[PDB]
């Protein structure tokens, strides 16, 4: 259909807009936040953080063309030190 490359003007992030807009259409009234660019070299270039009100947070990994690669539940217990 419509390719996710436009550019809403109310955001400060490039991919943060394109991927977020697609996320809103996938999650019914769920928690959606602006996304940041993941590692350039690889398959997943965009990480879309979304959370269902059920208490489940999943990050949608998008490829170079914003095609859904896979969705795994994202937790925050893995620190680094």
CATH number of the domain that 47 lies in? 3.30.505.20
Phi, psi of 72 (to 5 degrees): -115, 145
Strands 46-52 and 31-32 turn out to be antiparallel
CA–CA dist 24, 35 (Å, integer): 12
Q: How was this structure determined?
A: NMR
Q: Residue 60 in contact with residue 71, Cβ under 8 Å?
A: yes
Residue-number span of the structural domain to which 21 is assigned:
1-81
Q: Hey, how many other C-beta atoms are within 10 angstroms of the C-beta on 58? A: 18
Distances 43 to 25, 37, 49, 68 between C-alpha atoms, Å: 23, 12, 17, 11
Domain count of the fold of the chain: 1
């Amino acid at each position: 259909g419509a390719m996710a490359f436009d550019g809403e003007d109310e955001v400060t992030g490039p991919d943060a807009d394109r991927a977020r807009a697609a996320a809103v259409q996938a999650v019914p009234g769920g928690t959606a936040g602006e996304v940041e660019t993941e590692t350039g070299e690889g398959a997943a270039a965009y990480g879309v953080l979304v959370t269902r009100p059920d208490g489940t947070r999943v990050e949608v990994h998008l490829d170079r063309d914003f095609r859904v690669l896979d969705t795994e539940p994202a937790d925050g217990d893995g620190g680094l030190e």
